[PDB]
Amino acid sequence: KDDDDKLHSQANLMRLKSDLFNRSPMYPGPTKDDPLTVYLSFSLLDIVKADSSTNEVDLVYWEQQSWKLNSLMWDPNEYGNITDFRTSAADIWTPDITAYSSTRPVQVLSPQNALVNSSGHVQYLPAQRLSFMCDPTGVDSEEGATCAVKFGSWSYGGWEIDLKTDTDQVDLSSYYASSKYEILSATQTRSERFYECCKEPYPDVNLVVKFRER
Amino acid sequence: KDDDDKLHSQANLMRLKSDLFNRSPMYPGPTKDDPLTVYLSFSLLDIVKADSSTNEVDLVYWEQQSWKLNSLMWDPNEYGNITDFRTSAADIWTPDITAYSSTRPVQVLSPQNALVNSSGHVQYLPAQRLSFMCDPTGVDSEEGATCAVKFGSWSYGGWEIDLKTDTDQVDLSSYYASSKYEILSATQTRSERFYECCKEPYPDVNLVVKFRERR
Amino acid sequence: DDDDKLHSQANLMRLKSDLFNRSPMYPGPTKDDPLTVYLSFSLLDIVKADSSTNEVDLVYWEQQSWKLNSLMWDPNEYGNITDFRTSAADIWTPDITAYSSTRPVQVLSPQNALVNSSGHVQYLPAQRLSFMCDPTGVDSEEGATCAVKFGSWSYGGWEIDLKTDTDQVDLSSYYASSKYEILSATQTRSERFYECCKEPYPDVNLVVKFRERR
Amino acid sequence: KDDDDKLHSQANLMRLKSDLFNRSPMYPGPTKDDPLTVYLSFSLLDIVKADSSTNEVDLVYWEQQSWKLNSLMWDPNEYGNITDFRTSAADIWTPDITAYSSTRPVQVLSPQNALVNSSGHVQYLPAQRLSFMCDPTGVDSEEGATCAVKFGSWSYGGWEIDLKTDTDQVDLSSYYASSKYEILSATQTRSERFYECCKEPYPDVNLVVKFRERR
């Protein structure tokens, strides 16, 4: 009936995945000769705690990571008109973006699952709680306090992975209104850094947040 | 013989799980062409802590999840008139339902097991302790504090996974009599979210709790 | 005697291979193959009673024991081995939970079971459980009282039956210098029934009367 | 060259590790017909905290375990004259020795790796942080306070696993000079019990620590 169509779609999905993760090897990761661009964007849910005894602030946020792999492309016509699929992030290569000034291991607040689609684009959007080095002086004033945290590849330079922000403005829309702290401003900026060691540029995305007690 | 029956019974179950799990590849997940409906529900047990300095609350509750897969269906006459069986939750596909509001990784307080039966209905009922953003303010008065947390699939829209609920009434019959906090109202409310960007519905269940200090 | 030692080990490996490799792991109890599990508690310490969260922390040993026909053997075929120790991971274990725990149960002991030729299993693991309790009275003479129910999570009385050896919780191992004194501890079986759905459910109720020491 | 010496070096070890682990099953454990002697010795590094509110003390120490297995023996002449090698603690069998009074799961501060040598002796030294039941009362005085914690096999009796101890003196040579607590005495004593149940003796090693606030 109509639900035989349900079967073919299940069968078609299995088949696509098989073609992708079994018939073909897992991605070795970007190389100088296969540079990759990773798009990074932040949405800030809560500032849970600002600790002036340890100088550590706790953020809860979503981090949108996306990038494209030719290895992940397919023609939806051969696979029953499937233009995408959800999958565990264990089954696909994921980038090593990390907070550079984490003071604690990051806690993952969301299922770790990615969306892949026919163009070979991947959307990974992990929700997480980060503790990072922040001195909150003046959080209780009106001018407020400001803390920065940088994100980027741990093991890869600009010639292998390239960071870009699609928007310079941090997304404040889902932030918690009844949170102890209120956001004056938050901005995600991209930078490039150099070392005498090597001529390769090293990108980071610097997250700057201004906030006060509420 | 009584023993011979116990024997056949077992073998039957092994064969049955074998047919589903070994012989067919585990279910790939829902698609638009093959949507899934998940029924949620909540049973309240304890509000353990309300933290005024961080604005977080600790809740201990049962979250009931149900769904149906044709893949899990079988004929009881085929396998010993077995109408249902228990299984480890890692043996079956489970839905990526998550509280969108959590401040700490959820902790599981019970075995992870699911009931499954002949028509392919899965029943999963994890006990959990959750910390989420809430404002305790006013919990020391008569009106109490009201807090809320949204649950829904993290990776899936309403055209793949659709959220539903038995009732709008949270189950308090199991709530801890001696808890530091007493519960005034508790509700589970469904809604669908729509974005500028996309035509697809994004459902959630909204758990709303009204609570105050016990004395 | 060396050879005798080598033959004892060969025998044990062979007995083990027959159960966990020759035949596939027990699917668990059912209506037509029900199981009885005996529970007995031994109370070690009450480490903390928190008045602010209404939580109590306990250290205790939980004796679980049961019979499985698939675990039987005739010692003569196997070098007169009448019992062995095994990793609890290797055998089906009943799913018994504290119903009113407020944290994940912490395991203090190696998880290892005793099996013998009649097919009886004995598993005792030391745990720290924190659960829902009202401490008030703990600073009085009469003392505070708390209770926790233990039973199966996903099985009913028709599949798993609960039973106790005695109604007397064992205090013989209870820490003398503990912050809290144990006035009484009882362990009582009860069956939960419904008008609605016809299958009994069991549980064992650990009730503890305790006060601050003087 | 001096390279060839290194290649045989590696190959003989890979070879030796394979003959023990791959071509032979893992040791089933001690039995009444095949008993094993375990040596337990302690070295104290720190007493981190005494908590007078819960009556628990937190201790950092090395626990040295030694035993000899016939199935770990080899002739050095036959592999490269290799008399010993380091392996992951998970590759071999380990005795299950536990603090009987621990109030939290133990935390390992060190890699888990053992040393094995040609006569079948194994030496395993995990650095651990343990919390055990102790009443700190008197730790602010001159006599200090005294606690004890028994270690032993959880699942095996004296006819299967035989506990012995190196010294009655717990090694203080590595203890931390600047600790909030000074150690007056630390001793490790072997002991055995009997039960109404059985004739088989149960050994434990009793670690008794006397300490007081340094100042």
Next chain:
Amino acid sequence: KDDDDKLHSQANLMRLKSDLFNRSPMYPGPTKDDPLTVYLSFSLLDIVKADSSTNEVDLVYWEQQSWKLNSLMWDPNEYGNITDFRTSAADIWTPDITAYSSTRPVQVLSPQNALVNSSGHVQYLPAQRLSFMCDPTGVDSEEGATCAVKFGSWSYGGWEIDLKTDTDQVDLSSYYASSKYEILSATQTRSERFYECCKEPYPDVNLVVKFRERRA
């Protein structure tokens, strides 16, 4: 075309990793007959907390580790002129190197991935947070406190793994300027210790740190 080079790139590196890892057995570890030198280097980041009740301190740093294995070499010519690659550190051998005075299990703040190059050199650099035994006394003083922590192999002696440092100067350039505590000095120094038990040396690197409550 342009994308052809891309493929050969991907294929080449999958082939290289296959020859080293799936074709050859993971390295058995150093031996007295095949010893190894690991270099340690420290870059100090934050002293997060100093606990004067328990005398433990919490520290954040990067620890650079490098060694060389002949078994990890290749000719870049046979292999598309790949001169190095990134990999998970679970796929290679890593030295067991522990802070000896740790009071709580080390936490890792970064991805455990390591870089390997055609000469055979391996370079591994985790961020960690360490609780270790230190008495913060006179951290109030303008003169500060002083603490040290030892690092070495847990299971290996000096004839199997020899421990070295590139500079006796700890790298402070990445230190957090707004930290509760300021760094007066940090040194990293190689020690060697003999026991009666054996005539074999046991190396360690000592990290010595003098800090005080920051006043800016």
